[PDB]
Amino acid sequence: MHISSQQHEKAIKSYFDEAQTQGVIIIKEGKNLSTYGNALARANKEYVPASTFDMLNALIGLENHKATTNEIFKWDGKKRTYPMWEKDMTLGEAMALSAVPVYQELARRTGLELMQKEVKRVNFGNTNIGTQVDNFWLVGPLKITPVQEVNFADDLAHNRLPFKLETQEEVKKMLLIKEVNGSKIYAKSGWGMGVTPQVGWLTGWVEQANGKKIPFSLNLEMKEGMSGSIRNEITYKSLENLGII
Numbered sequence: 001m002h003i004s005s006q007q008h009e010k011a012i013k014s015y016f017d018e019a020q021t022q023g024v025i026i027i028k029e030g031k032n033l034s035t036y037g038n039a040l041a042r043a044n045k046e047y048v049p050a051s052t053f054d055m056l057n058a059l060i061g062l063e064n065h066k067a068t069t070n071e072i073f074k075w076d077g078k079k080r081t082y083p084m085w086e087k088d089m090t091l092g093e094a095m096a097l098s099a100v101p102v103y104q105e106l107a108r109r110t111g112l113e114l115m116q117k118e119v120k121r122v123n124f125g126n127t128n129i130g131t132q133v134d135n136f137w138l139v140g141p142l143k144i145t146p147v148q149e150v151n152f153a154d155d156l157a158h159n160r161l162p163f164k165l166e167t168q169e170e171v172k173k174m175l176l177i178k179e180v181n182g183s184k185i186y187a188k189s190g191w192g193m194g195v196t197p198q199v200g201w202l203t204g205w206v207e208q209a210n211g212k213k214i215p216f217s218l219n220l221e222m223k224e225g226m227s228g229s230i231r232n233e234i235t236y237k238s239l240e241n242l243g244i245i
């Protein structure tokens with residue numbers, strides 16, 4: 001409580017400065033939105049959601065019975081970009097591994113028509129998915145702002161999205177990435193590689209010991225030959241600098 005806001009700002013900026021990237025982390029305490037980082041103006045610019053869209057993809061899928069919690073999506077046995085994707089998995093493992101081929105399977109089962117209306121219903125980002133049901137979150141035209149992303153995380157953390165409570169829980173249980181100091185961090189990472197320049201995301205929330213939920217959204221530029229870890233390390237440093245974890 002004794003650290004100056006000036007100091008918080010400078011430390012969080014330096015986290016981004018030390019990664020030699022440009023980015024912003026938005027944090028929501030209650031209804032108050034706070035913007036940090038070394039590139040504050042990214043806050044209301046639009047980027048592709050990339051794998052962040054998996055969270056909505058899973059909500060849509062599960063709500064409309066295109067899959068279940070336990071269903072095993074079989075690997076077709078073709079080569080994948082990463083060897084860890086060359087196995088059979090649930091939605092939940094696909095979420096942790098960011099296995100897009102699974103989420104494309106789920107997008108295909110949902111179908112363009114049902115995807116468009118469901119993404120209009122949820123009012124996610126710019127809400128346009130175009131005509132290609134299997135890559136619209138990767139190369140456009142679906143885009144969203146860091147502010148919009150943290151508000152979606154807030155919505156999801158609090159069960160406010162227009163989906164069943166069981167659906168929202170099922171997807172939330174897939175999102176645990178770290179336990180720290182009796183705080184749980186639930187989030188989804190994102191690395192849009194099919195856009196110039198590349199966008200990195202880590203969107204989610206901290207659930208504190210006491211019970212309050214603190215949504216955040218990190219968003220930065222990835223320069224190829226940069227580690228995906230940086231998204232986590234910057235987020236964790238920021239949340240700890242602000243005493244959120």
Ligand SMILES: *C(=O)[C@@H]([C@@H]1NC(C(=O)O)=C(S[C@@H]2CN[C@H](C(=O)N(C)C)C2)[C@@H]1C)[C@@H](C)O
Nearest residue numbers: 050051052082097098100189190191192228
């Ligand atoms: C989603 O944005 C894309 C995938 N998302 C991520 C990510 O968010 O980190 C990756 S990276 C992939 C997942 N874990 C692998 C890894 O770190 N090891 C090989 C150990 C790499 C994808 C680019 C999705 C749309 O492709």
